[PDB]
Amino acid sequence: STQDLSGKIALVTGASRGIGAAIADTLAAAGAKVIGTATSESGAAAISERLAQWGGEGRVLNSAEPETVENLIADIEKTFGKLDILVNNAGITRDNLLMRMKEEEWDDIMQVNLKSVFRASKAVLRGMMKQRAGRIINITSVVGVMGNAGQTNYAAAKAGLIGFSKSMAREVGSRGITVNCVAPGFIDTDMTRALPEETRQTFTAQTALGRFGDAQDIADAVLFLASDQAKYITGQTLHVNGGMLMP
Amino acid sequence: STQDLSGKIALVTGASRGIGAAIADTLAAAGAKVIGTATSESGAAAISERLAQWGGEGRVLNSAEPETVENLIADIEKTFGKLDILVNNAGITRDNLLMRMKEEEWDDIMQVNLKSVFRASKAVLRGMMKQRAGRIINITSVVGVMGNAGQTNYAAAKAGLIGFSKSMAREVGSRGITVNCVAPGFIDTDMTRALPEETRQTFTAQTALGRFGDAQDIADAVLFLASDQAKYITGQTLHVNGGMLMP
Amino acid sequence: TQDLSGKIALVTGASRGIGAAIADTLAAAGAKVIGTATSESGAAAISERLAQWGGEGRVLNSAEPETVENLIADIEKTFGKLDILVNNAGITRDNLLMRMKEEEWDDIMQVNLKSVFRASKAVLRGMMKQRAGRIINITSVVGVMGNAGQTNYAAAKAGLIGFSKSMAREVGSRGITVNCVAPGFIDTDMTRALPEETRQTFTAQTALGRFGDAQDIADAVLFLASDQAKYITGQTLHVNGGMLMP
Amino acid sequence: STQDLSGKIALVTGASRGIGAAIADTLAAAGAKVIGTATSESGAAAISERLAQWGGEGRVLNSAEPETVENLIADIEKTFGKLDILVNNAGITRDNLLMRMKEEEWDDIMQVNLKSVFRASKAVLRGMMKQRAGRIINITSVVGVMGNAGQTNYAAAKAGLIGFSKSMAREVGSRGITVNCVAPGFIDTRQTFTAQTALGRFGDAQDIADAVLFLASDQAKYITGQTLHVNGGMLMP
């Protein structure tokens, strides 16, 4: 029961910044060969430069396009022989009050945040089942469990991701594959930075620890779940929120 | 503190059979003017015949079509003056293991089971907010909370529905509108009633009460939530499962 | 229906607030209601309040041994087997864990948790005889989310939920359901006193933007006690205005 | 964000066998000075023998007696300077149908499984607050969350432990102390049981120990008031 990921191959979607970036760095530093994705060639290049010291690399992935995720995964499998760890972190927000919410704001969220996970998870499955080993780790927000005004779309997608994960866990468990979610609370990121103070102050006041978390806190939890230390943990949602929600 | 729905107007989607039919009958018997929907003209006619004794009616609704949900709700508002209660029960299944699930099986579930609720809930909102009164009640399987092999799609949609509901509850609560889910467990429906007896016993064994529930049990819970007896209940998931899951 | 005609109900802690509303509501629905208080004076007041519905007040100090058991035996002999038990009796003894007295821990566990063990056990034999048993435990939102200064109260209320789930699994084959109702911010005398500016901090946590009423809890209990909830067991029904959405 | 516990002092109650034993071994191997407890002298001796290679030791702790928990913790604090990690694992079962359950079966469970945690957690608190650092980790069974026939007493105690932990987490969090629970499912100590899991097998005591090490470490500094389920998918909250 070590966290040595030497010889493992990991795919981290949405690895250009914040939580995704920390996850990729952490798995790479633990010994995994890491492929991190971004939606742009500049994002991918940055990931490649950042992961270079650990032999990791950046790749372009537009989750909306058909057959792109599938090709990427096939390429990884062919080049490296297997995919051991999939971290689904790619996601966007399109916040609006339901009263004002556009159809496209709903649809884009469901496609980018939820369908993307269906596609990636399905694609890695054949290989993982054949090897009788795997980790799928989905990054889902606290908002998925408690709901949030202005985020009926984002919350629905993140909650759906949890329902998806539990169902997948039941399908693939007999082959030793675990499927879990990590639920960040208020983590210091671009999204939390753009917040006004009463909102920020209101958020920190809800936490037991009295502070925002760090992207590294999420990465730490992902490493734990990706490792042999979590081989009997599946279908779970691990909340990393400083005590803002205690289910 | 009564369950007298005299003077209330209710829309129940998917009211042709089973749970939806029982819900419509129950709200109607409690005094509500009930509009129940089906996907076909024959379904709608059958609903009309069934609800005739209570002054209810059947209408055609194909949730996949744009502007149909919206037009129906507008028509109800104009004909009957307001919409007090929305029960989102329309849903389908397209079961498969993730490893062979077709893209269309994913997409159709998300459209029919989840996007339909976005559309209907958005559409009734203007009227409910003006009235400073309302009930939205979403029927969400237990599978949404615990997951189910073969149903990554259905589970994702039903779990998403819960996240949606919690978020909506937070948006509309200041206007006195409540938004809740009812989560059926193993209920006797077309899809279960005709299962082999040995297989039925495997479901009933999981319950504390030792039996499949009845569609009427779900209807009873919906009536409670729709009434003045539940005016301080919002953002909740009421599990009606005979003890097969105790969250 | 929610017609409880012919049913016998015991409601512990029925003098005031939530418990009083529960007793009145079950009684008005047709049940023969026995409501409890810790003193004969309390019991007399309950008797006066329930008189028009044929209800009565009785004394129950949970701290005393054999009192719960004797009361239930007396009810069984005098009126008949119990159909409905509502465990509402409870106290608070708030303190920071750092300075919490042993007695503050022990008294909470005795009054709020062991009382439920004792009452639930005592009604069980008779209720198994009946067609449609109901045990309904009043827990607090604090049992599910925790609360600073209430490690004791929270532990007892959370324990009550674990107890209920386990009991539900034992007694279901006899048609008995066991459920909890979890009040959030319900207006009491002590919250009613708070400054208006202070009331706002509580209401801001709710989706509905207001405190609830004791009657809201009573309404939920009536639902669960009735034939309308025959397939609901081992559940915690949160009546909190959206302050917590599990 | 390492799992190096060098320089840390840990108290693990109920460390004689199974889960408790694995926890103590694991924290010790990670570098902590570990004190493990048992209710009997034979249990304490066995712990001492097992932890000897890591400089750990066994101590007798009868949670039912007053002032014993408190004295033990004070002794540890005086000898080692601080207590960094408390793992509350001590517990018993007294299973019976509620119909048959004796008052003593209820009372014993509440005393040994729940009050013991109140006492231990209270006792370590002053020191942890002074250090502005700590970990309290409570071992609570899946039965606390889902309930179990024959175990109204055990389930009530284990569920109560979770409520306690959440409340404590809210009180002590401003000082950087985290309070969490680990909920084991079916851990080895058959097909009808394994069929209830997604993984199709019983777990190992080491799986629980692995989760406790994670929570005890710097890798879990932003995790508090949580219940981490290690059940192979038997329950997915």
XYZ file of N, CA, C and O in Angstrom, chain A residues 66 96-103 106-107 110 114-115 118-119 121-122 125 129 143-153 155-157 159-164 166-168 170-171, chain B residues 96-103 106-107 110 114-115 118-119 121-122 125-126 129 143-153 155-157 159-164 166-168 170-171:
360
model
N -16.621 14.730 -32.009
C -16.725 13.276 -32.006
C -15.407 12.588 -32.364
O -14.622 13.100 -33.167
N -26.290 31.101 -15.050
C -27.425 31.994 -15.232
C -28.572 31.548 -14.347
O -28.681 30.372 -14.012
N -29.427 32.491 -13.981
C -30.675 32.145 -13.312
C -31.513 31.351 -14.297
O -31.507 31.641 -15.493
N -32.201 30.334 -13.798
C -33.010 29.476 -14.653
C -33.936 30.313 -15.532
O -34.125 30.029 -16.711
N -34.494 31.359 -14.943
C -35.391 32.263 -15.670
C -34.773 32.871 -16.940
O -35.477 33.111 -17.910
N -33.461 33.085 -16.922
C -32.717 33.681 -18.038
C -31.891 32.682 -18.824
O -31.297 33.032 -19.839
N -31.814 31.453 -18.345
C -30.882 30.495 -18.921
C -31.235 30.122 -20.357
O -32.336 29.678 -20.646
N -30.266 30.285 -21.242
C -30.419 29.897 -22.642
C -30.276 28.399 -22.841
O -29.510 27.731 -22.147
N -31.012 27.887 -23.816
C -30.924 26.482 -24.203
C -29.471 26.039 -24.437
O -29.067 24.956 -24.023
N -27.538 25.438 -21.213
C -27.866 24.104 -20.705
C -27.110 23.031 -21.490
O -26.365 22.236 -20.929
N -27.279 23.055 -22.803
C -26.726 22.012 -23.684
C -25.203 21.928 -23.623
O -24.644 20.838 -23.560
N -24.039 20.281 -20.354
C -24.273 18.824 -20.395
C -23.276 18.099 -21.309
O -22.836 16.976 -21.039
N -20.570 16.558 -18.735
C -21.138 15.233 -18.466
C -20.902 14.224 -19.587
O -20.358 13.138 -19.357
N -21.312 14.566 -20.802
C -21.129 13.638 -21.925
C -19.657 13.294 -22.152
O -19.329 12.185 -22.560
N -18.846 10.392 -20.048
C -19.396 9.185 -20.701
C -18.414 8.675 -21.768
O -18.000 7.516 -21.778
N -18.007 9.578 -22.636
C -17.136 9.216 -23.765
C -15.745 8.689 -23.355
O -15.305 7.636 -23.816
N -14.742 7.658 -20.320
C -14.866 6.469 -19.469
C -15.150 5.225 -20.304
O -14.575 4.169 -20.080
N -16.039 5.364 -21.275
C -16.363 4.248 -22.157
C -15.117 3.799 -22.914
O -14.814 2.614 -22.998
N -12.388 1.713 -21.074
C -12.947 0.561 -20.372
C -12.444 -0.790 -20.893
O -12.078 -1.659 -20.106
N -10.607 -3.373 -18.433
C -11.221 -4.686 -18.194
C -10.319 -5.845 -18.582
O -10.236 -6.840 -17.865
N -21.250 21.644 -5.370
C -22.507 22.195 -5.900
C -23.412 21.072 -6.439
O -24.632 21.171 -6.409
N -22.791 19.997 -6.898
C -23.514 18.814 -7.358
C -24.298 18.124 -6.255
O -25.296 17.474 -6.511
N -23.842 18.274 -5.020
C -24.491 17.624 -3.884
C -25.436 18.575 -3.149
O -26.502 18.171 -2.688
N -25.066 19.838 -3.038
C -25.902 20.764 -2.264
C -26.742 21.700 -3.114
O -27.687 22.299 -2.611
N -26.434 21.775 -4.403
C -27.110 22.706 -5.305
C -26.563 24.110 -5.122
O -25.932 24.408 -4.109
N -26.802 24.966 -6.107
C -26.403 26.369 -6.040
C -27.251 27.234 -6.969
O -27.359 26.953 -8.159
N -27.840 28.291 -6.420
C -28.566 29.278 -7.225
C -27.652 29.810 -8.336
O -26.481 30.082 -8.112
N -28.193 29.936 -9.539
C -27.425 30.410 -10.706
C -26.712 29.297 -11.454
O -26.128 29.523 -12.518
N -26.783 28.086 -10.911
C -26.040 26.964 -11.460
C -26.879 25.704 -11.587
O -26.382 24.606 -11.355
N -28.142 25.856 -11.970
C -28.997 24.686 -12.212
C -28.366 23.753 -13.238
O -28.451 22.533 -13.105
N -27.712 24.329 -14.241
C -27.036 23.527 -15.264
C -25.778 22.810 -14.761
O -25.632 21.596 -14.922
N -24.762 22.293 -11.651
C -25.157 21.368 -10.575
C -25.751 20.082 -11.108
O -25.448 18.991 -10.610
N -26.620 20.202 -12.105
C -27.223 19.017 -12.707
C -26.159 18.121 -13.333
O -26.184 16.902 -13.185
N -25.220 18.727 -14.043
C -24.130 17.967 -14.667
C -23.227 17.292 -13.629
O -22.861 16.124 -13.781
N -23.902 16.629 -10.397
C -24.686 15.583 -9.728
C -24.843 14.353 -10.622
O -24.738 13.208 -10.160
N -25.101 14.591 -11.901
C -25.229 13.491 -12.861
C -23.969 12.651 -12.955
O -24.011 11.432 -13.099
N -22.841 13.332 -12.870
C -21.529 12.702 -12.890
C -21.349 11.706 -11.741
O -20.779 10.607 -11.888
N -21.865 12.090 -10.590
C -21.861 11.195 -9.429
C -22.760 9.964 -9.676
O -22.334 8.840 -9.441
N -23.979 10.167 -10.170
C -24.864 9.029 -10.515
C -24.256 8.093 -11.556
O -24.267 6.873 -11.414
N -23.687 8.683 -12.593
C -22.903 7.945 -13.593
C -21.807 7.072 -12.962
O -21.660 5.886 -13.273
N -21.310 5.997 -9.831
C -21.843 4.904 -9.007
C -22.290 3.733 -9.878
O -21.992 2.583 -9.575
N -22.994 4.040 -10.964
C -23.458 3.002 -11.903
C -22.289 2.296 -12.583
O -22.235 1.075 -12.623
N -21.326 3.068 -13.063
C -20.120 2.487 -13.664
C -19.357 1.595 -12.676
O -18.900 0.499 -13.016
N -20.478 -0.129 -10.302
C -21.192 -1.413 -10.189
C -20.932 -2.335 -11.384
O -20.948 -3.548 -11.238
N -20.698 -1.749 -12.555
C -20.460 -2.525 -13.789
C -19.062 -3.092 -13.890
O -18.878 -4.176 -14.416
N -28.184 -0.281 -21.082
C -27.058 -1.043 -21.624
C -25.841 -0.875 -20.730
O -25.681 0.150 -20.092
N -24.970 -1.872 -20.703
C -23.668 -1.698 -20.070
C -22.923 -0.581 -20.799
O -23.023 -0.445 -22.019
N -22.185 0.223 -20.041
C -21.422 1.325 -20.624
C -20.572 0.858 -21.813
O -20.485 1.544 -22.829
N -19.964 -0.314 -21.654
C -19.071 -0.909 -22.668
C -19.710 -1.194 -24.022
O -18.988 -1.386 -24.984
N -21.038 -1.235 -24.089
C -21.742 -1.286 -25.387
C -22.842 -0.230 -25.581
O -23.594 -0.270 -26.561
N -22.923 0.725 -24.663
C -23.920 1.791 -24.776
C -23.686 2.648 -26.006
O -22.596 3.171 -26.218
N -24.725 2.790 -26.808
C -24.667 3.657 -27.978
C -24.799 5.122 -27.596
O -25.505 5.491 -26.663
N -24.125 5.960 -28.358
C -24.223 7.400 -28.186
C -25.682 7.885 -28.162
O -26.053 8.744 -27.365
N -27.363 7.275 -24.821
C -26.986 8.340 -23.888
C -27.794 9.610 -24.181
O -28.472 10.157 -23.309
N -27.724 10.056 -25.429
C -28.328 11.334 -25.834
C -29.842 11.381 -25.624
O -30.378 12.377 -25.127
N -30.709 11.768 -21.897
C -30.446 13.139 -21.432
C -31.499 14.134 -21.927
O -31.909 15.039 -21.193
N -33.954 14.487 -18.703
C -33.348 15.613 -17.997
C -33.678 16.969 -18.630
O -34.188 17.855 -17.948
N -33.380 17.129 -19.918
C -33.645 18.407 -20.599
C -35.129 18.766 -20.561
O -35.489 19.922 -20.440
N -35.742 20.594 -17.397
C -35.241 21.968 -17.574
C -36.310 22.817 -18.285
O -36.723 23.865 -17.803
N -36.799 22.306 -19.399
C -37.785 23.030 -20.228
C -39.111 23.289 -19.510
O -39.597 24.410 -19.483
N -39.816 23.049 -16.214
C -39.625 23.825 -14.991
C -39.420 25.301 -15.309
O -39.990 26.165 -14.654
N -38.619 25.582 -16.328
C -38.397 26.967 -16.764
C -39.721 27.599 -17.186
O -40.040 28.708 -16.790
N -42.287 28.679 -14.462
C -41.671 29.518 -13.434
C -42.234 30.948 -13.377
O -42.549 31.446 -12.299
N -42.353 31.589 -14.535
C -42.898 32.964 -14.645
C -44.235 33.072 -13.919
O -44.417 33.936 -13.063
N -43.929 32.366 -10.031
C -43.319 33.522 -9.369
C -44.285 34.695 -9.224
O -44.311 35.344 -8.181
N -32.230 4.745 -8.274
C -31.027 4.467 -9.075
C -30.152 5.721 -9.203
O -28.932 5.642 -9.314
N -30.796 6.875 -9.152
C -30.091 8.153 -9.176
C -29.198 8.367 -7.969
O -28.217 9.101 -8.037
N -29.546 7.740 -6.855
C -28.803 7.918 -5.603
C -27.797 6.793 -5.386
O -26.710 7.018 -4.872
N -28.155 5.579 -5.761
C -27.267 4.446 -5.470
C -26.526 3.916 -6.681
O -25.566 3.173 -6.531
N -26.962 4.324 -7.863
C -26.405 3.818 -9.121
C -26.989 2.452 -9.441
O -27.516 1.783 -8.566
N -26.883 2.038 -10.697
C -27.345 0.709 -11.121
C -26.615 0.251 -12.377
O -26.551 0.988 -13.366
N -26.059 -0.957 -12.325
C -25.411 -1.549 -13.497
C -26.405 -1.570 -14.662
O -27.571 -1.905 -14.484
N -25.933 -1.178 -15.836
C -26.768 -1.149 -17.036
C -27.482 0.172 -17.243
O -28.139 0.374 -18.259
N -27.340 1.072 -16.280
C -28.097 2.307 -16.296
C -27.245 3.528 -15.991
O -27.705 4.429 -15.314
N -26.016 3.561 -16.492
C -25.175 4.753 -16.329
C -25.876 5.986 -16.875
O -25.762 7.069 -16.305
N -26.613 5.815 -17.967
C -27.350 6.924 -18.575
C -28.555 7.376 -17.746
O -28.696 8.550 -17.435
N -29.300 6.653 -14.594
C -28.794 7.103 -13.287
C -28.225 8.512 -13.339
O -28.460 9.309 -12.440
N -27.451 8.798 -14.378
C -26.878 10.130 -14.536
C -27.986 11.162 -14.668
O -27.926 12.229 -14.065
N -28.987 10.844 -15.482
C -30.115 11.750 -15.690
C -30.912 11.960 -14.409
O -31.254 13.085 -14.073
N -29.925 11.393 -11.212
C -29.071 12.095 -10.248
C -28.968 13.575 -10.617
O -29.048 14.439 -9.758
N -28.824 13.854 -11.909
C -28.771 15.238 -12.400
C -30.032 16.010 -12.061
O -30.003 17.188 -11.741
N -31.150 15.317 -12.153
C -32.451 15.861 -11.830
C -32.536 16.325 -10.371
O -33.115 17.372 -10.052
N -31.947 15.537 -9.488
C -31.857 15.914 -8.085
C -30.989 17.174 -7.912
O -31.380 18.101 -7.221
N -29.816 17.214 -8.538
C -28.962 18.420 -8.481
C -29.656 19.661 -9.027
O -29.602 20.731 -8.436
N -30.321 19.497 -10.160
C -31.163 20.541 -10.749
C -32.206 21.059 -9.754
O -32.350 22.267 -9.556
N -32.427 20.817 -6.394
C -31.821 21.531 -5.263
C -31.446 22.969 -5.648
O -31.707 23.903 -4.902
N -30.841 23.124 -6.818
C -30.435 24.443 -7.304
C -31.653 25.325 -7.570
O -31.700 26.470 -7.146
N -32.650 24.772 -8.243
C -33.898 25.499 -8.494
C -34.586 25.921 -7.192
O -35.058 27.052 -7.064
N -33.272 26.639 -4.426
C -32.545 27.796 -3.883
C -32.871 29.094 -4.633
O -32.870 30.162 -4.038
N -33.189 28.990 -5.921
C -33.552 30.171 -6.738
C -34.957 30.697 -6.513
O -35.191 31.896 -6.585
